[PDB]
Design an enzyme around this catalytic site. Structure first.
Site, PDB file in Angstrom:
ATOM      1  CD  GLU A 227       8.092  49.952  34.445  1.00 48.60           C
ATOM      2  OE1 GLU A 227       7.394  48.963  34.215  1.00 48.60           O
ATOM      3  OE2 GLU A 227       7.884  50.874  35.255  1.00 48.60           O
TER       4      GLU A 227
ATOM      5  CG  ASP B  93       2.769  46.348  31.468  1.00 48.87           C
ATOM      6  OD1 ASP B  93       3.785  45.609  31.542  1.00 48.87           O
ATOM      7  OD2 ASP B  93       1.680  46.245  32.078  1.00 48.87           O
TER       8      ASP B  93
ATOM      9  CG  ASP C 267      -4.563  45.231  36.526  1.00 48.33           C
ATOM     10  OD1 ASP C 267      -4.586  44.080  36.057  1.00 48.33           O
ATOM     11  OD2 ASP C 267      -5.062  45.597  37.611  1.00 48.33           O
TER      12      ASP C 267
END
Lengths: 158, 158
Positions: A66, A7, A138
């Site tokens: 992604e 990410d 996160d």
């Protein structure tokens, strides 16, 4: 069988490494690369040094990243692009195959609903990984694009 | 001594190497790498190779890229941001010092005016590097940026 999930971004690229023994999911390690520095060359340098580091350390079979369906601010996106590209290439130059998943597909997959709020996805990432997580910056988001690949990879052709 | 300016483009990427000797400007070569290929993972990597094969084959001292600021297409931003991040890294890793020039310092340096148009720019490049020459495509966009470096290298110390 061992999946790197990345990410990536301007500021910091997070990472989630996990194994899958057919259906037995398993946490190996996660984290966030912090490429805050002002200069681009060097911030692009750090993405690469780090990623290929993880590779060289976790020895992963696949590369999960992604994609972008809703990537709305023009000049915010140029910067995602360079962060994106460097991460991809470090992976490729490491011989690992790159798998692009739609965030649409990452929610459906983890939590069972593609309209699910990010914390509902983070919550499931950590249930499943049984992460005694007392969260951070996160990393779970990278962990989640990791789970996904498995589901799809062990779901495609039949 | 040896400058390389690059024009990273998801589909095409021009380069321009020039030799600065004292105040003597000299043209080594130019072209365009055609990275036209479907699979994103390969375009990127092709950028990476292509750019690197020019770095070894030509052997620059410096690397000069023009900054990208205004654009308002955010699907294309992400398309130009990958490639341009892969082109920069390619040089980071070959040990090249990388410098970015704003599209307006380039015009101010070769055309004399800031709000110039490329026909002018490219027109004036062939002159600088005394070369009434036969454009393949037109890497004139990279020679100008490399030319800029030679100028904004020759400017304040004392």
């Amino acid at each position: 069988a061992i999946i790197l999930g990345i990410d990536p971004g301007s500021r910091v690229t997070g990472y989630g490494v996990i194994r899958q023994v057919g259906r037995q999911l398993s946490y190996l390690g996660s984290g966030c690369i912090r490429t805050k520095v002002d200069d681009l060359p060097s911030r692009l340098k750090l993405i690469y040094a780090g990623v290929t580091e993880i590779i060289t350390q976790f020895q992963p079979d696949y590369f999960a990243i992604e994609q972008v369906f809703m990537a709305k601010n023009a000049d915010s996106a140029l910067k995602l692009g360079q962060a994106r590209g460097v991460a991809i290439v470090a992976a490729v130059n490491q011989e690992l195959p790159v798998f692009e998943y739609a965030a649409r597909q990452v929610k459906q997959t983890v939590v069972g609903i593609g309209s699910a709020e990010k914390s509902q996805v983070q919550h499931m990432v950590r249930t499943l990984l049984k992460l005694p997580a007392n969260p951070q910056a996160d990393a779970a988001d990278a962990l989640a694009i990791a789970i996904t690949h498995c589901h799809v990879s062990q779901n495609a052709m039949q």
